[PDB]
Design a protein around this ligand. Structure first.
Ligand SMILES: NC(=O)c1ccc[n+]([C@@H]2O[C@H](COP(=O)([O-])OP(=O)(O)OC[C@H]3O[C@@H](n4cnc5c(N)ncnc54)[C@H](O)[C@@H]3O)[C@@H](O)[C@H]2O)c1
Ligand SMILES: NC(=O)c1ccc[n+]([C@@H]2O[C@H](COP(=O)([O-])OP(=O)(O)OC[C@H]3O[C@@H](n4cnc5c(N)ncnc54)[C@H](O)[C@@H]3O)[C@@H](O)[C@H]2O)c1
Ligand SMILES: NC(=O)c1ccc[n+]([C@@H]2O[C@H](COP(=O)([O-])OP(=O)(O)OC[C@H]3O[C@@H](n4cnc5c(N)ncnc54)[C@H](O)[C@@H]3O)[C@@H](O)[C@H]2O)c1
Ligand SMILES: NC(=O)c1ccc[n+]([C@@H]2O[C@H](COP(=O)([O-])OP(=O)(O)OC[C@H]3O[C@@H](n4cnc5c(N)ncnc54)[C@H](O)[C@@H]3O)[C@@H](O)[C@H]2O)c1
Lengths: 346, 342, 338, 346
């Protein structure tokens, strides 16, 4: 269940190439990998058809959500010699699995980030929004120390709907219960851990009607898609703070502006937005504005305009503790592959 | 009783009425008092004659009084000062004593507000919410150096366990932290949560996060200094939502740069006189240079520093308490009831 | 000569800068001068009770209701620290015996140099650079700028300010062209050609609007004329928001048809400009929220200043001294002209 | 040049520090001339020099390392030519290149208009408080205080140094309508023909509303601006420096800023730029940022009347074109065995 011991010499002969190695990937990943693998190539640019020829000679490609593997790039990784792709994340969506089947490449993945990391990020948003912390930081940096219109709100007895009670939502429910909020939950299947905290399960319509704060933790499924829309928003409680760290597909962004301007939605925290492909995990600040105009998302940039909206760039999973897990699971995954163990993260 | 008809005839003026003071306060006051004068500018000698017919002056922290303004406020006729805050410190009770002017005030903010704000600072710093917000607004959606930290199993020292420290201890335990406390007197609501009381030195040595809730006393002045900081745990997040006097600000720069203090949240800074509760951006820079605080401005420069402008008390709920305590304060004064607030 | 000194003046909308430039010179003349921080409406007009002259600004509105309360308050004169009388009615003033005076021109170098400052800031991405550097991003991408030296610049409108804009731009080294119904001989003596608007729109790298707002000029820049411009054009409007049809800006920004935009003015400034909306709760800000304006501020190649083109030591001085002379002339029964 | 183009095309070129702007201005032109061109995003090290294996010419920038040790590894990689996409050779070791057979070529001049227009840019922005204005408008503060600006038309402007760049600064500023005065050890006949008088340094400092530094950094010009000379200036003076950080003693700035002696400061440059400029430090954890933290620079950025750009005065479409075409011509001449002339050597 641990060490190698010297089967590690075999693991060490594995040659790993890692795409999209940005500063944080260097910080958490590069160090642990070179302790195990003798040869590891860290490529800063993402993975495409032009940087896939970079992988010639390597056995395994380490990838992230922003890296592309569709049918064209899988063919040149297979011809490069890499027979395993390991994701440092749990998203496999952007990889083509039908292409991997033809080319013999096996893909392994990290199914779980540490659930406290994500749950605590949702809670961070609530606190920031309640206390208008981003507003105040900026004003104070400019040298505006006046109090208007920074007046905030107490969380202590507020009613909190937790939508979806899986691993992360459970953590959200625990934390929000501990802050002292009155917590309610909705899920298709009740979580006994949540019930044992004394948080009642109610129907979704009831949860939307009674909540000061609603936090989305459910997965994105056809049944959950645009859970928040023009209709369900009119069912919520006027002034509601809506938090989403799960999936952008859970919210229909078009409906948000009217709801915000009517005061129907009083506040919005988001770690996610419905179309993030090409948008997130990119610093667009580095491109000339004429080039930024090519992929420009106007309704997103408009959304960012509101003082009661707060958006982070998909950092809810991004934590020392979560990265450590991602790293050790990616490495255990490399080893299981090379040592012929059953993978299970495939 | 219809003593409210006696109460209603009370004439009230409030200084330093900014937008937020209008919102929470003016509405509730005119429900009670028939004649109510709201002055946007603060309290001085030149705006004390604005108080010439009124019975009671409602005041704030950044306002005065001097020993002397009690007199033309007195000759204005106001024998009562009603504070919308808990500081009477900046007014002298010795000048008011001579002029028959009585001092009343709101001694308590709802302590969850203050405690929850300290928790807000901790969360914001852990997750780089201010860095993240600004980048996202510019169109930088990249991840480096937004990497945060989990709070769940971290060790948190609460320094001072009075009303606000109690809520802070309570909240941080509910979140899952390992909470320790220091105070002269253990708070039994805190001991009943199974939070151990340890020595200040032990608490500084073990804490990942230290949050100061003690009052400013000679014993606690510059509690945090060059010496005590070296007693702490490398990388510590220090939070001060109480009094600027608890920290020796000069000592922060070396400690931030060595990594000894890993992050700092502040709702208070030691010299707030003339600094806080003013929007300095409305002044030409040459006028700003006159009161410029160089070490405060340097301090804002660090990415791991987060400073709010004394907003920890500032909440719907807390403003409500203040309002209703202030209105009860006016009423008790008028009806010759005992004040209890002074 | 000591008769003028006896004048009693109230000034509405006194913010900090109004204090700095104005109150000092005024109290050198008039013995009693009342400065009210809040603007002019119905309710703060009774503050003018007894005063003979009220000095006002653009954010102050005087319709029939606020005019009646000052009139019975006693003020027979309104003096503007600005050139707009638009928000006041002159027909109500006719009925209540109150006369309208104003400062009709700011120092045109101030206004023109501001248009030039906008061009320079956008060319060199100064706002981007400032903020990044404040954050500690000292990297070079995507701060790459543009030279102004040989660029083609259209000046639309040749009056006192456009003249200065033309002069400055020629001195910078640009190839300057102009459109106006009346050629300005000062502009022609600089060897700047007057051409038709279509020709100017087709050839300009930088187009800067200096014409007044007239029925002929309204939405001068619109969906159709924009397609007549040169792809990548930098558009500057320091005159009037009505000269531009704002709705049309977004597709054109996004198509690259307009490459950059500076604005000191926007078509709907009513209730919007000269207010710091950040002192309000967001639930209150949502009431006057201008979504297309907030969207517009979103673009990296857009730069908007809050109607500061006139706001200058020199221009504030002119405004002050013309205001003091307007008051004096009224009191002395001289012909106004303002 | 047809056959010479095929011979030039056979050149193998590697470029270090290829960030977005280098891809934009450089890569396109290079791939039209050289058949094989390698663009590496990280800067040059001892470790990234091993990337140059097989390559003929390394294209480098001011931020790239050639100290005595990396020249050793580039030599053995096979590169005989180093082309700087810049005019600074300060960081390359020419004593090491001499020993290892490596020749260094360079771009000695950017368009002097680009730089001169940048200083003028700073002047306008500060005069009109454009950075303050932009930020407030973005937050939704549309109020006028303390944004009040100043007219440039009749102001007295000292230009210090009248070379290619100072000459342009003088031309532009006279054109704006300023009364321009100049100082140089040697008068520039083009400046005199603009009708701009030459005065002593003390005379210019005493009379100027605006001082703009364009002289090179010399033992005579070292800390030209210091505690003493600053008290000779005119109270409220705006100081602009786009030339060299060494011209100003940064310690002296704070007292003068706070006393009002220096009324405003625009800078494209600062005294120790090494490891500081051309890096985005926001990509690092704050704890790593604390290692090189420059307390006095960060403090300087705190002032409302100070404006700092990150060495962008040369950074222009037009200037980069000069740089690209001169660099490609530098390569071609080398390949075609022509006399170089942009060669720096020891
Ligand atoms: N850092 C980030 O922003 C990031 C990255 C990747 C994933 N995520 C999010 O984390 C989520 C996983 O959270 P988890 O750990 O708690 O997973 P989980 O499996 O443990 O919990 C999911 C729960 O949702 C419930 N559910 C199923 N259908 C539903 C419906 N129609 N309505 C409501 N609830 C329903 C399930 O019963 C289950 O209890 C992902 O789905 C994704 O949303 C976030
Ligand atoms: N919005 C703001 O930022 C704001 C405004 C006003 C006041 N405050 C701060 O909040 C404080 C009040 O908090 P509170 O309501 O809980 O008051 P409190 O009286 O209930 O708590 C004070 C506790 O500190 C203890 N104490 C006394 N001497 C001590 C020592 N040497 N060391 C350690 N502990 C000691 C006391 O026994 C007491 O239990 C104020 O003193 C002020 O510092 C903040
Ligand atoms: N600080 C500010 O931002 C601010 C404040 C108030 C007014 N303004 C603007 O400044 C302007 C005043 O500038 P000015 O001193 O140069 O005015 P001006 O009267 O002296 O010149 C206006 C010129 O526009 C010309 N013109 C008339 N119809 C035209 C048309 N259809 N097309 C093109 N040109 C036409 C006129 O012939 C005239 O020569 C105001 O009209 C206003 O737009 C700016
Ligand atoms: N993007 C940037 O910010 C950037 C990049 C590279 C270089 N630069 C600057 O541009 C400079 C080159 O400018 P240039 O093209 O005009 O070269 P230049 O030779 O034509 O200008 C320098 C002038 O200063 C004069 N001079 C010499 N000693 C002097 C003294 N003691 N005092 C005053 N003046 C003196 C020289 O005679 C010369 O005329 C570089 O030295 C550098 O400072 C800026």
């Amino acid at each position: 269940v641990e060490l190698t011991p010297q089967e590690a010499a075999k693991v060490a002969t594995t040659r790993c190439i890692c795409y999209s190695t940005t500063q944080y990937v260097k910080d958490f990943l590069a160090g642990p990998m070179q302790k195990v693998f003798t040869d590891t190539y860290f490529v800063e640019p993402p993975l495409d058809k032009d940087t896939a020829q970079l992988a010639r000679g390597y056995d395994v490609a380490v990838l992230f959500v922003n890296d592309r593997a569709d049918a064209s790039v899988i063919k040149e990784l297979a011809k490069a010699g890499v027979k395993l792709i390991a994701l440092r994340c749990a998203g496999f969506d952007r990889v083509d699995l039908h292409a991997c089947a033809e080319h013999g490449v096996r893909v392994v993945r990290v199914p779980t980030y540490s659930p406290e990391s994500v749950a605590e990020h949702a809670v961070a948003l609530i606190f920031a929004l309640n206390r208008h912390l981003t507003d105040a930081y900026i004003r104070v940096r400019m040298g505006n120390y006046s109090l208007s219109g920074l007046v905030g709100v107490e969380m202590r007895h507020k009613v909190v709907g937790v939508v979806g009670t899986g691993a992360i939502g459970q953590q959200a429910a625990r934390i929000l219960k501990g802050i002292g909020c009155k917590v309610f939950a909705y899920d298709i299947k009740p979580n006994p851990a949540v019930e044992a905290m004394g948080i009642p399960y109610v129907s979704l319509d009831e949860l939307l009607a009674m909540s000061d704060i609603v936090t989305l933790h459910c997965p994105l499924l056809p049944s959950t898609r645009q859970l928040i829309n023009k209709e369900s928003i009119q069912k919520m409680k006027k002034g509601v703070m809506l938090i989403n760290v799960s999936r952008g597909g859970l919210i229909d962004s078009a409906a948000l502006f009217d709801a915000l301007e009517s005061g129907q939605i009083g506040a919005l925290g988001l770690d996610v937005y419905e179309n993030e492909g090409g948008l997130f995990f990119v610093d667009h600040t580095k491109f000339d504005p004429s080039v930024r105009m090519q992929k420009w998302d106007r309704q997103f940039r408009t959304l960012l305009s509101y003082p009661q909206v707060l958006v982070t760039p998909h950092t809810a999973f991004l934590t020392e503790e979560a990265l450590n897990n991602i790293c050790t699971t990616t490495i255990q995954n490399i080893a299981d592959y090379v040592l012929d163990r059953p993978l299970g993260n495939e």
